[PDB]
Amino acid sequence: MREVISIHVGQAGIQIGNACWELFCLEHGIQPDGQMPDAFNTFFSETGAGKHVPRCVFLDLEPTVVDEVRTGTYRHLFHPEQLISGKEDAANNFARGHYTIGKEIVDLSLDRIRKLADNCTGLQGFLMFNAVGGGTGSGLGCLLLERLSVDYGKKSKLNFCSWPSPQVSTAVVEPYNSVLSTHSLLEHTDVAVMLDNEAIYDICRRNLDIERPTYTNLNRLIAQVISSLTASLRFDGALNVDVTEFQTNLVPYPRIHFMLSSYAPIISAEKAYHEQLSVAEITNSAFEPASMMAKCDPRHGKYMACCLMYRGDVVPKDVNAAVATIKTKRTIQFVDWCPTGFKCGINYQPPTVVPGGDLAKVMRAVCMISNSTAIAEVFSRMDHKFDLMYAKRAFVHWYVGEGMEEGEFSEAREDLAALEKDYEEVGI
Amino acid sequence: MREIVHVQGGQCGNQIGAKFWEVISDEHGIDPTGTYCGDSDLQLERINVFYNEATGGRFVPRAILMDLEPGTMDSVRAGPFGQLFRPDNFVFGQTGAGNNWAKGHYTEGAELIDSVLDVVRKEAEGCDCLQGFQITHSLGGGTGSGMGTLLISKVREEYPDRIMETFSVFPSPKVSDTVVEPYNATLSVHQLVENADEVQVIDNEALYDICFRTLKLTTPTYGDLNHLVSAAMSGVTCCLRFPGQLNSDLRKLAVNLIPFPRLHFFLIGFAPLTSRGSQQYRALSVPELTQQMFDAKNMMCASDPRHGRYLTASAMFRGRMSTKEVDEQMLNVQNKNSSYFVEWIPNNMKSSVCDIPPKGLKMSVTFVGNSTAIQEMFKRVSDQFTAMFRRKAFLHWYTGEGMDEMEFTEAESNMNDLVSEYQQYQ
């Protein structure tokens, strides 16, 4: 029946996909061998008798991370050509990951995509997780997106992109891979979700009180975000908001599909101990700009749409009271032409808590995916980083010797600046 | 005799229709297995209005449950009183409307409505003379508001003179959910005024208000709200299934409240409605029933009747009460509150008595009232409709699959003239 096909390209895609599938196996109750000690058909197939295999591909040119996946704990949980490896890395180049070394791995990736999509008609779409600042995450991201568009046109291609966070980049050539990534995904990605490191770091700083998180601590947070969204597809609830319902209710104009995220409460043992996590309090705390997951301020941004997924023992009346209290709360302002701005959904099954992790037992949790005009600031400062990049040909000889000529940087500037003035004219 | 064929449109209509088929089932003594219990003549004296014999003794509802997703179908079946329905009456949808009026009315509603009309005519021609249909859906969704009204148009052209009663759950002024509310609502109502005999507006926040101030609930769920609507529409069809000193059917009711065929939108109130400590503290009589009925807090709709004129009205009382007191209380609410009633109709209201009360009530009453004070709903979804339409907002999820702008323009033009017809009668 209903199903989703996760795509995990880039090293960020491999590691985030590890946390998402560790969580999903923990939700439906399946061991790392795939056994049990019909609500799991969205993520897992019924292979053989009692075995369940994921609906995910791990497309990555680094063998040192995906061979290490296929030799670890879950080596029998994944079918051996779900995990797909190249030979040499793109190494933070859009050109190498899209033109030279990426064309010999897309032809094998689409073998597995078609072989898993023909399992049953009823697919909702794809959940593509990638790193924008990377080379395999962005170069192979562009090539895989356009072959998915030409073969599966009407399917809801979702994207959870690891955007380069504004002040920390862990790279130098990240503005080149990020401008060329948007030139692909404005015409390809149906729904894009802004993730970045720095906003997930400081919500681990202030809400989990962890003074040094690694990447996997970030990966638990993103795993709970995708778990709350797709919990509607797996478990029955009062308002089941599907993947198809996301793209209608959040996209007023087809070019703008860049939404920010928030997940609250995110609380450890010490501070799952002193609150009542009532719906009004955990929907205000989702709406704080500190709890944003993109390092983007809604104070100088006007809201357009706002979706709220709920899990747990959530009563609809207190949801309708709380969403009225946040409309009369006037720090956040909605745009004039869109007075109604909410799509709520309620699921009764609470998120199961990862043991040994960093979050605690929460009766009810809120995910939020909201569109605003504040996306101008997360595109303008990478514009200012890129125009001093391309001013005097820094790091250009690597890209132009790889197969694309001078000039593709220029239309990557023109269509992103067109995206800038698109966001300015909407909020007028 | 006379049968009413129920249709549940959308996931809202399925849940507020399953709540209907257990309170009618309780009223007629039917177990969820279909076996009768309760050893009284009057329960089974007219069972063919809502049920059909199955040559095994269990009664099946004349209900076509129909939707674009299997999400709420399996919840209706697995719920209590869920095995009562015939499985063949279900019409599954696999794609699911993404809360689009276009995607319901046009794209996948086309290849599914031929699979609903074949069982609707099966249930219609099965009996001798069908009285009409009742349909129950919400006007904020895609599959119920868009493709549910697609069924309404084609049952009209196939069965013209039958009564088409509609229970529409209108979108919200204040607490808006399913963000394309006015796009689904304005496109539905301009197609529904030409193809509906009776329409009854129901508002979720008015049901929330009733559950808070008059009934005093601390934990209200959707099953609470659906039971207000189901118990309200049990009183509309009491005289069809039970004897009374003064009978009233749906075609009886349509002549009363429709002076002109354009205005057919009504208010629904159910009395009595008392809380836990209050139910043993009030005197259950006619003057308090009509006083708790002719007030704003008991209306199941977010429009205040005191902000306009009650154009026509009706009250279907239930129980063994005086016919004296019913009629005198109708004269008192007109003589004292004369300013709230229009002057070119002498005795704007009427009444009926159904001798069988609801179980657990000595006496009750439902109210169906066509008022010109409901125009405030139409304007406040008009200015929300023109709020997005004026700069082409969310239109590409409607124009990309076969709907154009000039019948969007016909949508508000068929919407403002409804308000102007109400203005001239006030």
Binding site: - | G79, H227, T274, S275, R276
Partner: peptide, 18 residues
């Protein structure tokens, strides 16, 4: 199922005997 579970109004619509 538990989407529509009214264990309080089904008994508020009958004369309670506390």
């Amino acid at each position: 199922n538990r989407r529509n579970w009214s264990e309080n109004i089904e008994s508020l619509l009958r004369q309670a005997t506390p």
